[PDB]
Amino acid sequence: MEIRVTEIKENKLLGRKEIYFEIIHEGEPTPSRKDVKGKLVAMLDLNPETTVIQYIRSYFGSRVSKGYAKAYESKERMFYIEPEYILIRDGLI
């Protein structure tokens, strides 16, 4: 797969960077959340312990998946804001 970061928003209130990206996965199966996270962590040199994938979405008209990740300033902050299901399926809990 190849990832293209399209926008990074700062959220000083919630202590996080909001990262919007595209996942190109032609001539391969749709990547797992874990693989996509691993790829994004590597590219932006993120702390995987304070990074969550909110979504990896696919669309009817499109071969390219759209992703939303958050990189938290701290794991305590992440835990305060993020719902439990997000932390579970992204391996944080």
Domain holding 53: CATH number? Answer: 3.30.70.330
Q: What are phi and psi of 40, to 5 degrees?
A: -65, -40
Residues 6 or more apart in contact with residue 39 via CB below 8 angstroms: 1, 3, 31
Sheet containing 16-24: which strands, arranged edge to edge? 2-11, 16-24, 65-72, 51-57
* Residue found by looking up tokens 């938290």 in the block: 72
Letter for the amino acid at 1? M
Q: How far apart are CA 82 and CA 47, in angstroms?
A: 16
Label the pairing between strands 16-24 and 51-57. Answer: unpaired
Domain count, the chain: 1
Containing structural domain, residue 22:
2-90
Q: What are phi and psi of 79, to 5 degrees?
A: -65, -35
Q: How far apart are CA 69 and CA 46, in angstroms?
A: 11
- State the method: X-ray
Residues 6 or more apart in contact with residue 71 via CB below 8 angstroms: 16, 17, 19, 44, 46, 47, 50, 51
- For residue 16, give the nearest of 24, 8, 27 by alpha carbon: 8
The answer to whether 53 and 69 are in contact (CB under 8 A) is: yes
**To one decimal place, what's the resolution in Å?**
1.7
- For residue 21, give the nearest of 60, 61, 54 by alpha carbon: 54
